[PDB]
């Protein structure tokens, strides 16, 4: 079955056959599309098919499908599962696995970069302290004094689901939010709940507007424990504007390393529940969402007040105007400090080239339009006019419930 | 089977039950999502009729009653004999209003119940059609105080006797191929503007030339008509702060009036049914002026603001985009032609969703089309989960007639 996508700006039509390798589900039916819904212990029984599916992919990719080496690895994995109920990936499989989870990540605009990923194998880790050390090294390597490199750190896989490695932070670096008794928030309102957990656990809160949260780390299903990332490892950029001099007096800064720590990496049926990965920012992830969501830093008011915009009728487009200046400032602040960053025009163009190369060379490119198009200026970036097909390939990154909801407290 | 939708800014959760009364297909499977794709006998007509008449008699609190059963029998008889049926006026008004209520791609639907329906089912020629359309345009324009309306020409019979409006909108600017190599006017209509010339259009060759109507009645060859210029309310565009703006000499029309769609009520197909409401500002400023495919005037503008056009990262496209849109909105409001900004339109649609969950058990919404093509995440719809499903009565795309017409 052939599926076709069109670009309405250029009339380029592409053909997807890759959807024919699709495994998991979308949440969509013939009767409903759930394309805009955010969220739409395993036995031998299901594991070997998945193992086999993976090893077939791997061995195709390295040009060895049906080789001795391939048949041997198959039998070897077979035995290990029948003998222990699980199995272990070779280094090369792990690497290939993590690279493809990113390649298959349909909500990610950054995938032109997919082959350049530094994989750190933390599968010998046994304690939270070991976890901390691995993460610090991750952050230092990735940061690279502002010349960011993509990386991921992979901790031991799930066994019985009672011995899980988890990183309780949703990103390795993030600011505290503190709900006040007057009902207002200090710092980042996205992180209030997790900030409370940290305090509960015994973090001493500086109670500032930009406090870097401490890592909260669970090893081998144990209760998790706290650790401050050394401040010298945390690259930050003060936010200033090129024409606007009052902007710095807003007292804003942001960290340079986006590092997602809360997802689950699935490779050949195995489940890696701590696999923090990091890249570099698209300006709009800070400029639009972090500063200008209402449920976030919500600084459009202040930028607008200070810009002396007409704020009496929404149709002055005063919000639209402030939003642009803030994003101008974000790109400008990062670039002056030589901290790697991409603007949304650049990132979408690259992604369209990636996507076409993926169709030509791989037979498709799962793409989630709701997440790929940027959250400002949608229609003047070329992704807006691009038809995309969304589907789930493995290896993959998955959401997983927050650990404070599922953890049995050992005390 | 009871589906939840969450807003991520307000944490408000809604429960959709209306989707189980859902009829047609989406395009998507549990394997592949087609959300971002633009276009994904009498033995069959009676169920369709009944489905409709049941919802009609239910809406007037007269479900399972004498009049109800009487009507279902009458339509059954008419189908068995004639192979089609005719809608009562009341059913007509209800069907049209609901095709708009079910339009999953329309941010504007808080307005659904205030629609003026013009019954043109007695129409028989292209001249007739033209008269009905002039009257629609005049009524809906209302010297700037725009009012929603729809004009419904006769339903499909055997499919060789179709009424069609060949224009995609009643009112649109011409677009001509150029020796130079660039495109003159509006490039979206190039093919259409040529077919006009070819049937004999008096093309004046300009950049804002209102296209002639091109009307087919009862399956016959189509005919040309110039909407009286005095019926087409246009707006010169100017900036509230940039005095040089006017020198671009931009104008846009007040009336958006979709005319290439099909209206399905109770199994019947009304293939000529142009409808109109009023513009959201971004429809003109973001898309009409700034698309590569369209007037593409960002480059020309940004220069006048003297912005650093050297690097994408100065966000010069974004800066200019905003001022262009401030200007469209400003002009319309100053010439007193109805217009809505995206902040207000999206806010209104959230109020509308709430209502439709409360009162109907849901509201099919297509997020890809609802979120404005600029400033998405600062409008409330961005954070709003939506379910997309096809209800009836409804509007549908149909082939451009020229790719289908027996000429
Ligand atoms: C090269 C730098 C990168 C850039 C500029 C980039 C860009 C982005 C952006 C803007 C998003 C959406 C964020 C949002 O909508 O809130 C995203 C999503 C995502 N990206 Fe990337 N990305 C990069 C590298 C990576 C890497 C290294 C990985 C992992 C190997 C990754 C995996 C993902 C995943 C799983 C999502 C979706 C997360 C979710 O569903 O919540 N990206 N990407
Ligand atoms: C009253 C003010 C109205 C506003 C502000 C409005 C707004 C919009 C917007 C912004 C779109 C997006 C389409 C695009 O970007 O091209 C749209 C599409 C649509 N609206 Fe409305 N609308 C209005 C009235 C109406 C009326 C009167 C009807 C029908 C009775 C209608 C039915 C539709 C349909 C069917 C679409 C999708 C058309 C397509 O698939 O191309 N709307 N509307
Ligand atoms: C490596 C990398 C590089 C880069 N430039 N950007 C990213 C994505 C980062 C991200 C940040 C936030 C925030 N704040 C939320 C998110 C999504 C939060 C979320 C929330 C929910 C409810 C579900 C779900 N799947 N995801 C992602 C990653
Ligand atoms: C009544 C009303 C009010 C209002 N404010 N806006 C509308 C939509 C009008 C419209 C504008 C464009 C454009 N540009 C394209 C279109 C059609 C774009 C299109 C194109 C194709 C190929 C299929 C399809 N379903 N739609 C419509 C209507
Ligand atoms: C492929 C993609 O869905 C397509 O370009 C859509 C996206 N969203 C849109 N949204 C609106 N309102 N109007 C459009 O024309 C489009 N185009
Ligand atoms: C409800 C809606 O699906 C949700 O808020 C999505 C929309 N698109 C998004 N797109 C990106 N890139 N990131 C997001 O968090 C979201 N949020
Ligand atoms: Zn879908």
Rg value of chain A: 23 Å
Q: Could you say which structural class the secondary elements and strand pairing of chain A correspond to?
A: alpha+beta
Q: List the total number of helices of chain A.
A: 10
Compressed to H and E, one letter per element, the order of chain A equals EEHHHEHEEEEHEEEEEEEEHHHHHE
- Inertia-based shape of chain A: globular
Family (chain B): Belongs to the NOS family.
Binding site for (6R)-L-erythro-5,6,7,8-tetrahydrobiopterin (chain B): 36, 368-369, 382
Subcellular location (chain B): Cell membrane, Sarcolemma; Cell projection, Dendritic spine
Binding site for L-arginine (chain B): 169, 278-279, 283
Question: Would you give an account of this structure?
Answer:
- The structure is a homodimer.
- Helix content of chain A is 33%, strand content 12%.
- Chain A has 411 residues and is an alpha+beta fold.
- Chain A has three domains: 16-123 and 150-160 and 264-278 and 348-372, Nitric Oxide Synthase, Chain A, domain 1 (Alpha-Beta Complex), CATH 3.90.340; 124-149 and 164-235 and 399-403, Nitric Oxide Synthase,Heme Domain,Chain A domain 2 (Nitric Oxide Synthase,Heme Domain, Chain A, domain 2), CATH 3.90.440.10; 236-258 and 281-346, Bovine Endothelial Nitric Oxide Synthase Heme Domain, Chain: A,domain 3, CATH 3.90.1230.10.
- In chain A, the strands form six sheets. Chain A has a four-stranded mixed beta sheet, with helices on both faces. A three-stranded antiparallel beta sheet of chain A has the order 5-8-9, covered by helices on one side. Chain A has a three-stranded antiparallel beta sheet with strand order 14-13-16.
- In chain A, a hairpin with a 6-residue loop joins strand 8 and strand 9.
- In chain A, helix 1 (44-61) packs antiparallel against helix 2, helix 6 (283-292) packs across helix 8 (318-336) and helix 7 packs across helix 8 (318-336).
- Chains A and B meet through strand 1, helix 6 and helix 8 of A and strand 1, helix 6 and helix 8 of B.
- One 5,6,7,8-tetrahydrobiopterin sits between chains A (8, 384-387) and B (36, 38, 368-369).
